């Protein structure tokens, strides 16, 4: 379960984004080819050198997120596809973030940000036309954690490459709702560390019980958002049997002495067919059961 915290390619995703230095550097592009106006940010000061260009996102509330994943979708043009400019041209860009308990507004200070990684392209764009008709879209993803503050900024630094940013998707992972072992487990946040495996408590479904001497149901949430290593289980209580992940009353003519995994048993020999959802079957008239004998026993005739 991926819960998205900010999506650039979406309505108003460009929102409150900022460029530094003021003026040139990163710039907001518009593409109106489809009836939908689409947006991107690009920079191509590959001839100039001494390039330090910053694009900061809006301030995004992290909410319950401990670890955030950042999904970037970009194109890089070739440095030598530009007549004689490689002397100052680069083909990577740098991904920065900053944690912040307040929205700083239009304030930006490079020094407050922390380098997550160099972002580099898997496929380069080589075109002979100044305006490249066909693009090679790259997809890269990084993670940071744990987050400690109310929100955070993302910023992108260009060192002199020819980059276009089409999509910035940042999300956190969660373990979904689950029915397992006749217990309902609630939607749980994931952990930030790989060794982190918290325990989450199962709620026996209607007409299910944790056995008198047995482990209560635990599940563990992982970093990917997949549950792991079930501990214990609930059981369909007496008079009920497991049907899918619910507990159903025994059919008339069946019984179940106690909570177990097994289905209801047919009423034993020399008994009266039981009503719906019974624990034991009554002895047929004129027959009896030995008092030491459990109700699963057949009844014998009264001597």
């Amino acid at each position, epitope marked *: 379960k991926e819960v998205v915290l900010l999506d650039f390619a979406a309505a108003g995703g460009e929102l409150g984004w900022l460029t530094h230095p003021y003026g040139k550097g990163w*710039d*907001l*592009m*518009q*593409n*109106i*080819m489809n009836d939908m106006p689409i*947006y*991107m940010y*690009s920079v*191509c000061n590959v*001839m100039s050198g001494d390039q330090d260009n910053w694009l900061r996102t809006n301030w995004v509330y992290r909410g319950e997120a401990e670890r955030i994943f950042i999904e970037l979708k970009f*194109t890089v*043009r070739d440095c030598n596809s*530009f*007549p*004689g*400019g490689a002397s100052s041209c680069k083909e990577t860009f740098n991904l920065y973030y900053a944690e912040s308990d307040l929205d700083y507004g239009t304030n930006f200070q490079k020094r407050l940000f922390t380098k997550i990684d160099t972002i580099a392209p898997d496929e380069i764009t080589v075109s002979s*036309d*100044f*305006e*490249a*008709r066909h*693009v090679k879209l790259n997809v890269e993803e990084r993670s940071v954690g744990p987050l400690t503050r109310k929100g955070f900024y993302l910023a992108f630094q260009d060192i002199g490459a*020819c980059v*276009a940013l089409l999509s910035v998707r940042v999300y956190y992972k969660k373990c979904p709702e689950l029915l397992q072992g006749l217990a309902h487990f609630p939607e749980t946040i994931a952990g930030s560390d790989a060794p982190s495996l918290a325990t989450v408590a199962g709620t026996c479904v209607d007409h299910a019980v944790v056995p008198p001497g047995g482990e209560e149901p635990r599940m563990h949430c992982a970093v990917d958002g997949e549950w792991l290593v079930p501990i214990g289980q609930c059981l369909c209580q007496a008079g009920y049997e497991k049907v899918e992940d619910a507990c159903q009353a025994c059919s008339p003519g069946f019984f179940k002495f106690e909570a177990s995994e097994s289905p209801c048993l047919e009423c034993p020999e020399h008994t009266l067919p039981s009503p719906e959802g019974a624990t034991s079957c009554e002895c047929e008239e004129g027959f009896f059961r030995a008092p030491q004998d459990p109700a699963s026993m057949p009844c014998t005739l009264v001597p």
Partner: antibody
Framework: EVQLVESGGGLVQPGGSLRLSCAAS????????IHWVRQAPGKGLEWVAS????????SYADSVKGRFTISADTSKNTAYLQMNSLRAEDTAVYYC??????????????????????WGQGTLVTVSS | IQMTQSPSSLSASVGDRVTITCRAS??????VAWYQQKPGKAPKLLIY???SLYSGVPSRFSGSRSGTDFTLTISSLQPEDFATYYC????????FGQGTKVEIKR
């Protein structure tokens, strides 16, 4: 005030050469495309050539490729069109114009694109004996 | 690509609504530009990015897109609006339309 000024036009014999000049002021060429568009008398606007002085890219209309070379000189903030092998069909008013360039086809700067927003006044080239 | 203008020329009275259409041969970028050219003078930009009114241009001019069909509109034709109008591909070949000559009927 942004300004583009053509000169170099005039009367030239068939097969001759003429070099046009587009003197820009009020802005620096490096930030934009510099175009040449031509209008044969009684005819429509024909785009002909373009240059980005920052990137050094050049492109031409087919009617012109191989015979005309557009260039630029960042120092004088001026663009030129060298025309060779002129024919009667090249008789036209030659305008120059600017536009914001884009490295990505189909994309425009939200704040800086305004198509061919500023033009020169034109210089007449007449190819005749 | 090619860019076809319709009609080739037209006549209208003052205060008439005039509509000029530009049709793109193939699928191009939708950043069609519109220009007004007085005989002997440089073209003047009217509309850029198919619908944006260029600074200074009177609001009677407007640009619209309906698929492959780009239209320039003059809501209230003024005597000073006599000119030739050109749509233009606002992308790589920058190709110009065939033009439409507009004369004022009186």
């Amino acid at each position: 005030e942004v300004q583009l000024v053509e000169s170099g036009g005039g009367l030239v014999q068939p097969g001759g050469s003429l070099r046009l000049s587009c003197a820009a002021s009020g802005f620096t060429i490096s930030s934009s495309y510099i175009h040449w568009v031509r209008q044969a008398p009684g005819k429509g606007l024909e785009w002909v050539a373009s240059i980005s002085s920052y990137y050094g890219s050049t492109s031409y209309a087919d009617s012109v490729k191989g015979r005309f070379t557009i260039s630029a000189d960042t120092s004088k903030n001026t663009a030129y069109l060298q025309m060779n092998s002129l024919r009667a069909e090249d008789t036209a008013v030659y305008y120059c114009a600017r536009s914001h360039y884009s490295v990505w086809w189909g994309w425009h700067s939200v704040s800086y694109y305004a198509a061919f927003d500023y033009w020169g006044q034109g210089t007449l080239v007449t190819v005749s004996s | 690509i090619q860019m076809t203008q319709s009609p080739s020329s037209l006549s209208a009275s003052v205060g008439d609504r005039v509509t000029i259409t530009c049709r793109a041969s193939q699928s191009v970028s939708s950043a069609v530009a519109w220009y007004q050219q007085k005989p002997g003078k440089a073209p003047k930009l009217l509309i850029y990015s198919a619908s944006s009114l260029y600074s200074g241009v009177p609001s009677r001019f407007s640009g619209s897109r309906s698929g492959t069909d780009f239209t320039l509109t003059i809501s209230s034709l003024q005597p000073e609006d006599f000119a030739t109008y050109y749509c233009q591909q606002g992308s790589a070949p920058f190709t110009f339309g065939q033009g439409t000559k507009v004369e004022i009927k009186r």
